[PDB]
Amino acid sequence: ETPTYPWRDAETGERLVCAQCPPGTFVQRPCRRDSPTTCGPCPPRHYTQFWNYLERCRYCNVLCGEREEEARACHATHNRACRCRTGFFAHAGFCLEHASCPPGAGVIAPGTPSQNTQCTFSASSSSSEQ
């Protein structure tokens, strides 16, 4: 029940069924008559998430930037993923700032990396006071 793919041999040409490579690995060398598939590990900054017949690993193209922090790094199976830093939230792609709330009707729901701030007395206009 190990995943597979067909392949044709280099020396004269013979048709065979080569085993796929597990997540974390890539196809280093295909099958010969005697040996099956050679699976080598994904190099630094490169990943394979699935069972594959990839000649070389996928590059970790996701790079967190100014206002982004990591969620997963780039390992042999993960691709790097990003999320917004403490005082930021994601809107429409870009990662924008959390909204402050003045005195009056202060913060009822704090800013998550996912949503903006929702909002007796409040002394200050921050994104904290209740």
Same domain membership, residue 129 and residue 79: no
Same domain membership, residue 39 and residue 6: yes
Q: How many of the other CB atoms lie within 10 Å of CB of 33?
A: 8
Domains: count for the chain:
2
Q: What is the 3-state secondary structure (H, E, C) of the chain?
A: CCCEEEEECCCCCCEEEEECECCCEEEEECCCCCCCCEEEECCCCEECCCCECCCCCEECCCCCCCCEEEEECCCCCCCCEEEECCCEEECCCCEEECCCECCCCCCCECCCCCCCCECCCCCCCECCCC
Phi-psi region of 121 (alpha: psi -120 to 50; beta: other; left: phi over 0): beta
Same domain membership, residue 94 and residue 77: no
Same domain membership, residue 54 and residue 44: yes
Tokens of 126: 């921050």
Deposited resolution, Å? 2.9
Same domain membership, residue 50 and residue 3: yes
Same domain membership, residue 91 and residue 60: no
Same domain membership, residue 30 and residue 15: yes
Same domain membership, residue 114 and residue 75: no
> What is the phi/psi pair of residue 101, to 5°?
-120, 120
Q: How many of the other CB atoms lie within 10 Å of CB of 105?
A: 11
Name the structure determination technique: X-ray
- Measured between alpha carbons, how far is 110 from 55 in angstroms, rounded to an integer? 47
112: CB partners within 8 A, 6+ apart: 89
Distance of CA 59 to CAs 25, 29, 38, 85, Å? 13, 19, 20, 24
State the residue range of the domain holding 45: 1-85
Same domain membership, residue 127 and residue 100: yes
Same domain membership, residue 94 and residue 63: no
Same domain membership, residue 4 and residue 26: yes
Same domain membership, residue 104 and residue 71: no
Cα end-to-end span (Å), the chain = 58
Q: Report the CATH number at residue 55.
A: 2.10.50.10
- Measured between alpha carbons, how far is 35 from 110 in angstroms, rounded to an integer? 59
